[PDB]
Amino acid sequence: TYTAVQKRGSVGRSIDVNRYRGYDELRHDLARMFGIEGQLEDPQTSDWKLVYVAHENAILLVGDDPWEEFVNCVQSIKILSSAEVQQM
């Protein structure tokens, strides 16, 4: 019932997204957990692409949706490098 978070070359993590207030908190925390602090909080500054798995297995950008809908549909979360993105 928790949400897996994956990042290439790191040990995966698992989180209850309902613990979070919204996207800023979620990002800060994930930056902490993956030793990547500072690099997710500003999605305009940050190279990484914070992304999630959705019904019909559709990969979507985190933060487009209002928080409530995201919480209700998110199946897992990935942090993607620019290269991973270019390899999709």
UniProtKB/Swiss-Prot annotation:
Disruption phenotype: The arf7-1 arf19-2 double mutant is defective in callus formation. The chain holds residues 1038 to 1125 of 1164 of the full protein. It is found in: Nucleus. It comes from Arabidopsis thaliana. Expressed in the whole plant. Homodimers and heterodimers. Interacts with the auxin-responsive proteins IAA1 and IAA12 (BODENLOS). Interacts (via PB1 domain) with IAA17 (via PB1 domain). Interacts with IAA19. Interacts with ARF5. Binds to JMJ30. Binds to ATXR2 in the nucleus. The PB1 domain provides both positive and negative electrostatic interfaces for directional protein interaction. Auxin response factors (ARFs) are transcriptional factors that bind specifically to the DNA sequence 5'-TGTCTC-3' found in the auxin-responsive promoter elements (AuxREs). Acts as a transcriptional activator of several tropic stimulus-induced (TSI) genes, including SAUR50. Formation of heterodimers with Aux/IAA proteins may alter their ability to modulate early auxin response genes expression. Required for differential growth responses of aerial tissues. Involved in ethylene responses. Regulates lateral root formation through direct regulation of LBD16 and/or LBD29. Residues 1-88 form the PB1 domain. This is Auxin response factor 7. Belongs to the ARF family.
